[PDB]
Amino acid sequence: DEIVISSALRTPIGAFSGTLKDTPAAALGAHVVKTLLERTGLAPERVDEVVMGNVLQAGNGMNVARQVAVNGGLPVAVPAHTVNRVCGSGAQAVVTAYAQIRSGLSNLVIAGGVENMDQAPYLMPSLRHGARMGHTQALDALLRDGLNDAFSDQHSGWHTEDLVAKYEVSREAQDRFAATSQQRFAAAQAAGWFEGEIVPVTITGETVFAKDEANRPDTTEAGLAKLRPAFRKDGTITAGNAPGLNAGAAAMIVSSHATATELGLQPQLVIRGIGVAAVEPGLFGFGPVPAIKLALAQAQWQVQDVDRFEVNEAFAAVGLVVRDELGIAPERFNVDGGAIAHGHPIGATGAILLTKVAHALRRTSERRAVVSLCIGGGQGIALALERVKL
Amino acid sequence: DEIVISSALRTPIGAFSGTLKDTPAAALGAHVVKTLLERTGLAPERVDEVVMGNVLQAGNGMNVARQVAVNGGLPVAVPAHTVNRVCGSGAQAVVTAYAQIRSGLSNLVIAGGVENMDQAPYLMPSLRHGARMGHTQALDALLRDGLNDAFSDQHSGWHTEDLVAKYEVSREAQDRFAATSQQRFAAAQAAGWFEGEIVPVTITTETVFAKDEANRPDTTEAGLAKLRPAFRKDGTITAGNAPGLNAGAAAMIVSSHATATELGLQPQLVIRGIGVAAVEPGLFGFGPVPAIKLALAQAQWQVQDVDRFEVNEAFAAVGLVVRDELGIAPERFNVDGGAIAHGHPIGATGAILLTKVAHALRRTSERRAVVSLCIGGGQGIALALERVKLA
Amino acid sequence: KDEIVISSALRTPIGAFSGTLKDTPAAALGAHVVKTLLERTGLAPERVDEVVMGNVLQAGNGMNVARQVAVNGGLPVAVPAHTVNRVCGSGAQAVVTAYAQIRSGLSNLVIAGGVENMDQAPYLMPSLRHGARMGHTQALDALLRDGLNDAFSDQHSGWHTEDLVAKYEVSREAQDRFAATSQQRFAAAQAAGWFEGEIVPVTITTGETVFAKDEANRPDTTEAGLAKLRPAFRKDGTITAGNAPGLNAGAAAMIVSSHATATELGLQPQLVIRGIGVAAVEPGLFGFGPVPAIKLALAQAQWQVQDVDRFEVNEAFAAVGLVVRDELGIAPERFNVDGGAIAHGHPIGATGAILLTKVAHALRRTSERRAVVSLCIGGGQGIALALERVKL
Amino acid sequence: DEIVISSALRTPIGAFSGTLKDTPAAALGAHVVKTLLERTGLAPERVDEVVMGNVLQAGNGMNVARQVAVNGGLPVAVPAHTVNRVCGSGAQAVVTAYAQIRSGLSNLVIAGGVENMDQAPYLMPSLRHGARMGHTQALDALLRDGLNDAFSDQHSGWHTEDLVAKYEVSREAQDRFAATSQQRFAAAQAAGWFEGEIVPVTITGETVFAKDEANRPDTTEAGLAKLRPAFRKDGTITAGNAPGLNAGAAAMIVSSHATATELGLQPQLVIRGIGVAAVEPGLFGFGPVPAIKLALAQAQWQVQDVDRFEVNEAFAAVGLVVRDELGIAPERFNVDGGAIAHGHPIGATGAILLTKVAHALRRTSERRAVVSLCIGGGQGIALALERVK
Ligand SMILES: C=CC#CC#C/C=C/C[C@@H](O)[C@@H](O)CCCCC(=O)O
Ligand SMILES: C=CC#CC#C/C=C/C[C@@H](O)[C@@H](O)CCCCC(=O)O
Ligand SMILES: C=CC#CC#C/C=C/C[C@@H](O)[C@@H](O)CCCCC(=O)O
Ligand SMILES: C=CC#CC#C/C=C/C[C@@H](O)[C@@H](O)CCCCC(=O)O
C-alpha cells in the first residue's frame, strides 16, 4: 500500500515569448501524456483518472485536465479534473492522486501540471455590461489570476520584499544564490542530466524543441549587482534573482507499488510524507517551512536524513529563507539549479520538480528527497520521497 | 469512520443580470463560510482545509478557494484549493474532502462551490502579442471556459440535441419536464421548504436577497411549446426547457461521524457511495448513468431502494434520459424541482444539490438519496447519501 | 443676389446620453434629416453639388460619414461628399465650407450640416494591434480621447475651463444662475411649440417609438439643487454636471446657395450669411474663442454688437456663455434667448448646425432681423456667423 | 489671382510595422510643417489656416490639423481643421485651401495630409454599453473607417475585382503594371530624384529615416505571378499588385501668386483646374475619369496636352482602367512609379502626389500635370497643375 510515482516526464521549459508561445498548456500536457503511454505501454483502460494542475485557466477551454486526457489519446471513459493551489498546483495533482488511491476511489492516476504564461489572455471585466463612460482597464490574466495577491492586488515580488526585510536577506546573498542556480543548472544541462526526463516537442518548417531555453549560463553575481529592483524602488528583488514567465508541462503515474509491479511499470519514488500548510499571504515565501516539517514528520525523517531538497525558486529570497530556517546544507539545496535558471511555469512547476527529483535520485543513487513549493496567498506544499530500487 | 456532511448552507440563486450581478463568486462563498462558522460555533482552528469548486476562474483572482477561506474569516493557517470538474465541481469539492479524510490528509474540510456567470469577464487572446491586421474576437469566458465543448467549440446545448435524437426525447416531453420543474419548485418555495438552507445575502447599492429569483412559477407546457429552438434550427432545446446563467454559492462541513459528534455538529447525510465516470464528450448528458451505477454499487443499493434522485437539469432532455434509462419513478426524480426553475450556477450547483438533499431528507424523514450531475466534456459525478438521525 | 443664403434648415430632436438615439448611428440621423429636407423642398436631387457634414467622433462610423449621410439620405451616387472636423465648431464649419465652395465657383448648391452620437462612439484599444506584452493596458473612451480631452494636455475641456473661470472671475453662483435660466428658457420655448417647426421626428424600431421632442433637458432644475452638486473636473472647481451640457446625439442640415440659385429652384431662404469669423486662441482658454470670431464676423457684416437682435453662443459650459456675453457687453435677454446646450444637449459635430437651425426658425417666428451664431472649439478656436433674416 | 503651391515637402513613406510604426500621424505632419517654416523663412503670423487630410482619425486626439499646426511651431492664433474625403483627403486639403483663398476667407494656407496605419487603433463597439452574452468583435479601424466600403462592409480590393471584371483587366496586365511601378520608382529613387522633396525624420539608439522603405526593387512579373489573390478566391488582386498599409505626411503653402512673391516664396505649381466627381461606390476605381475631365475642362486642356498624369495606384487595376479609359500614353502615366512601390498612407497620399509632381516638373521642365486619386465610397478628385518658372 506504498504509493509510488512511475514514468515522470516533462517538456523542456519555454522562455516568455519563446519557443512554446503558440502552444496551449493543454497541448503541452497532452503531448507528455501521449508519450508516457507509448513509452510505458500502459493499457489505457487501466488509467482511472487524469488530474492536472493549471493556475491560469482563463481562455484554456472547458476543464484543462480533460483536454490533456482526451488529446493525450486516453479513452473517453477516463475522467479528469483540474486543480489550482497556485504555484503548488503541479505537486497538488500528485497529492490529489495519493488521496484518491488511499481512499479507494482510484487504483492508478496520471497526475501533473501545465502552464503557458504567453497563452494567458487579457481580461475585460467591463465588456459584459459596459464601461458606460471613461477609460477602462484590460487586465493581464497572468497578474490578476497568477502573480498578484488576491487580497492586496500587489505582485508576489512586492510582498516578498517584506520577507526579505523580516529575515534580513541581503541583495548580495540573493544575487549569489541566483548566479549559483544558473551555474548549477548550466553544468547539469551540459552533463546531459536532463536528457532522460525531457520529451521533445515538435513546433510546426518544423522545429524540435528539446532543451530548456530560459537559463543564462554566463550569469555572475557581479553582473546581477547591476540590475534595478523590479517591485519596489528601494527593493532587492530583480529580473535576475527571480524566475521568468515560462511554459511547460510534466506528468507521471501514481499507483500503489503492487499496481505498478502488476502493470510492468518501474517505480521511481515512494511518497513517504505529505505536508500542506498556510501562513500570512504577505509572508507566503515562508510557507514551505511548516509544509516540509509536516512531510518530514509523516516520513519520520530529520532534515539531516535528506540527500536533497528541491524547493521552488519563486525568488532567490524564498530559497535562502527556507534553506537557512531549516538549516539545510547549501550543497543539498536545489543541487542541479532551480526556477531562476530553468523557469517557473506556475501550474507545471511542482510536477517538474517531482520529475527532476525522480531522475536525479536514479542517477545519483541518493535515497531521500523533499520537494516543496511556496504558494501565493500564503501556502506551502511538500512531499518526502524515497528512491525505489529497480 | 463513516464520512458525513454537516451544516450544508447556500445563498439564494441569482438570475442572469440579477441581484448578485455585482457580487464576486468568491464573496458569495466567503459569506456562506462565515455564516456556517457563526451558526455551528465550530472552532476555526479545527478546519484543516477549504475546497471550493469554481469553473469560470478567469478574473476571480489568485485561488478562489483561498479567498473564500480568508474572506470567510478562517485563520490564515487554513490551506485551500480550487477544483474544476465543470458542472460537477461543487460535488467534486465534497468528493475531494472525502478522499482527504479517508486518506488521513485531513480530519475536517469545508467543501462547496461558487459561481457568478455575470462576473465572468471577456477574454482577448490577441491582446498580449497583437492582432496585427484585421478584426479579432473578444470571447465570452462563460462560453469559452464553461458551456462550449473544448473539442468542438459547440455549445453544450448543441451537443445535447444529439442526445435528444439518440434517445428520441420529444419536444413535448422536454416541455412537460420543464413546466413540472417550475411547478414543483414554486410549490416547495411557497411552502417555505428552502428557507432553512438559504443564507440571505445583504447587497449594498442595502437590500437583503433571501429568495431564489430565477424561477417562473406561471410556466405551462402550452406556453413552453411556443418558444423557438435556442441551439439548432430543427432543435428541441429552448430557453424554457434549459436553465439560465446563474450565480450562487453553497458550502458544508465534511468529517468522520466521530469528528462531527466530538465537535458538537449535527450530521445531515452519510456518504454511502461515490461514482465518477466519463463518456463521449458529444453525449455528456448520459454521464450520470454510469456514475450513479458506481455510487449505488459502493452503497450496495438498488435504484428502487432510493427515496429521491436529485439529478442536475442542465437540460430537460438530460433529466429525462437519466430518469428513464435508470427506470426511476417520475415522482422520485427532482422532487422539489431543479435547475430549470432555480438556476445552474455551474461550479456551485453540485454543492447546492447536496444542500437541497440534506434539508429535504431532514424534513421528509426519507432515508436514501442520490445526487448526480452531468459534466461538459463527457463526465458524470454521483453520491449515494443516507440521512443521519438527530442525536 | 450673389449673397449666400441658408434654406430649409432642419434638425432631429436631441437625444440624452444612453437615451432614445443610443442605437441610431450619427450617419443615420443625418440621412433622416437629408431625406426630409429633399421631400419638403422638392429640390431635384441632381441640383445638389456636394454634401458637407461635420462629425468629431469619426471612430467606428465607417468610411467618410458625409458620404453615408448623402447616399443613405437618398441623394444620387453622383453627388460628392466629405466630412469636416473643427471639433465643436464642425457643424457651423460645414456651412462655412459650403460658402467657400460657392463663392470660389467649385459649387452652386451644397447640403451642409453636422451629425454626432456620443453613445455610438466606440472604445479604442491602442495596444491591440502590436500587443500589450505584459501588464494591464487601457481601453480609451473615444468621446474623451478624440472629442472632449485637449490633444496637448490630455485634460478634459472642463478642467481647462476652470482656468477661464479664474481669469474672467466667473462665480459658481453666476454659472448655476446661467444654467437654471437655460433650463427655464428652453422648457418654456419647448412647451410653447417653438421647436416643432425645425424638428424632423425619427421613428426608432425597438415596437416602434416616434422620437419627436428634445429629451435631454431638466425643467425642474433649481439654483438650490445646482448649488449642491460636486465639481466634476477639479476638486475645488466651479464646473459641475449641472452647469455643463450632456453627452448627446443629433443631426441638422440645411441648403447653402446664392440667393439667385435659391429663388431659381423655388427654395425659401431663411438667413443671409453677412459675416464669417474663424479665430484661434491658447488651447487652455478655448472658451474665449468666440470673442475674436464674433468680432471678425461683425466686421465683415459692418454690424455693432448693439445692432444684433440675438446671440446664439454654444453653452459648452455655463462659464463660456458668461465670459462671451459679458466680454462683448451683450444684454442677458438677447443671449441664448430660447435656452442652450445645458438644457437641450451638445451633440458635438451637429451643435453648430443645430444653432444655425434654431436661429433660422427663431428669426422667422419673432421677425428679429439680425443674429450671431458662435461656438467655442476645443484646442483653442472659435467660429461665428453674422446672419440676417430674409423677408418673404 | 492665380492660386499657387509653394514649398511642397513630405516625409519618406513608412512600411507597415516599419520605421514610423510608433510615430503618430500628427507628429509626422508637425515635423514637415516645422521644416517648411525653417526653409521658407515664412513669418508664422502670415499663416491664416492649417488644413490637413486624415482618414483614420480614431485615437489621434482632438482635431489632428490643430495638433499639426501647434506642434509644427505655428502660433496658437492660427486656426486649423481636419478634412476627410478618404484617399482624396490630402488633395482635398489643397482644394479646401483654394476655396478659402478664392472666397476671401484666407490669404495663405498650409495644406496637406497625414496618416499612420500602424497607429490606427482597434475599436470595441460593444464596450460602452456591453456585449451582454456571447463573443463580440474588436474591429481594426484601418478596415472599418479606411478600406472597407461603408455600405457593403467589403474591402475596397473586393469591390475593385468588379472593376477588373467589367474592364477585363488581366492578372498579367496588373502584375506588369505593378512590376513597372517598382522598376520606375527604384530607378528614380537611385537617381536621387526624391531627395529634394523628402524631409528626413529621426526616430528614437536612433534611426535617421531619410528614404522611402516600402518599395521592392527586385519585383519581377514572374515573381508576382506566384502570389495568391488577396480579396476573392478566384480574384486577380494580390499583395504584390496593390500598395501596403503605410505612414507619412506632406504639406505645402497655398496662396495667390502675388502673396507668394510678396513673402519671398518660390511657387512650384499653378492650380489651373479642379475636379471632384462621384460614382457607384463599388466602382470607385473609375472615379478619377470624371474628376480628370472636370479639371481638364476648367484648365481648357486636352489629355494629349498633359506632360504627366500622377494617378494614385490604389490597385494596379485602377491605374490601368484610368490610363486606358482616357487614352493616356503609358510613358506619361505614373512616370516615377506610384503607391504600389512607395506606399499609400491614405490621408497623406493626395498631398504626397502633389509634392512629387511639384518636384518632378521642376527637374524635367515639363509644363503640365494632372494629379488624381480614386476615393473609397465612389469618388474622384483631380487637379490640373502648371509649372511656375
Ligand atoms: C505562486 C508563487 C509565486 C511566484 C512568482 C514569481 C515570480 C515571477 C517573475 C516575474 O514577475 C518577472 O520577474 C518576469 C519579468 C518578465 C521579464 C520579461 O519581460 O520576460
Ligand atoms: C457542464 C454541463 C452543462 C451545462 C449547461 C447548460 C445550460 C445553459 C443554458 C444557457 O446556455 C441558455 O439557457 C442561454 C441563457 C439565455 C439567457 C440570456 O440570453 O440572457
Ligand atoms: C469643442 C468644445 C467643448 C466641450 C464640452 C463638453 C461637455 C462637458 C460635459 C460632459 O463632459 C459631462 O458633464 C457629461 C456627464 C455625463 C454624466 C452622465 O450623463 O452620466
Ligand atoms: C480609399 C481607396 C482605397 C484604397 C485602397 C487600398 C489598398 C490597400 C492595400 C492593402 O489592402 C493590401 O496591401 C493588403 C495589406 C497587406 C498587409 C501586410 O502588409 O501584411
Residue numbers in the entry:
A (entry chain D): 4 to 207, 211 to 396
B (entry chain C): 4 to 208, 212 to 397
C (entry chain A): 3 to 208, 211 to 396
D (entry chain B): 4 to 207, 211 to 395
Original paper wording:
To investigate how bacterial polyynes target acetyl-CoA acetyltransferase, we solved the crystal structures of MasL in its apo and two holo (bound collimonin C 1 and collimonin D 2) forms at 1.78 Å, 1.66 Å, and 1.40 Å resolution, respectively. The asymmetric unit (space group P1 for apo MasL and MasL-collimonin D complex; P21 for MasL-collimonin C complex) of both structures contains a tetramer of the protein, as observed in solution. In the MasL-collimonin C complex, the conjugated polyyne tail extended into the MasL substrate binding site and formed a covalent bond between the terminal carbon (C16) of the alkyne moiety and the reactive cysteine sulfhydryl moiety of Cys90 via nucleophilic addition. Thus, the terminal alkyne was essential for polyyne activity through covalent modification on the reactive cysteine sulfhydryl group of acetyl-CoA acetyltransferases. In the further comparative analysis of the polar interactions in the activation pocket of MasL in MasL-collimonin C and MasL-collimonin D complex, the C(7)OH moiety of collimonin C/D 1, 2, His158 of MasL, and a water molecule formed a strong polar interaction network, including a direct hydrogen bond (3.00–3.16 Å) and a water-mediated hydrogen bond between C(7)OH and His158. Furthermore, although there was no significant induced-fit within the pocket, the collimonin C/D 1, 2 caused the Arg135 on the tetramerization loop to swap and form a hydrogen bond interaction and salt bridge, respectively, across the two subunits within the binding site. The C6 chiral center of collimonin C/D 1, 2 is critical to forming different polar interactions. The C(6)OH of collimonin C 1 had more flexibility concerning the spatial direction (with a dihedral angle to C(7)OH from 109˚ to 170˚) and built a sophisticated polar interaction network with the amide of Pro249 in the pantetheine loop, Arg135, and multiple water molecules. The polar interaction network derived from C(6)OH of collimonin C 1 further affected the distal carboxyl group binding model.
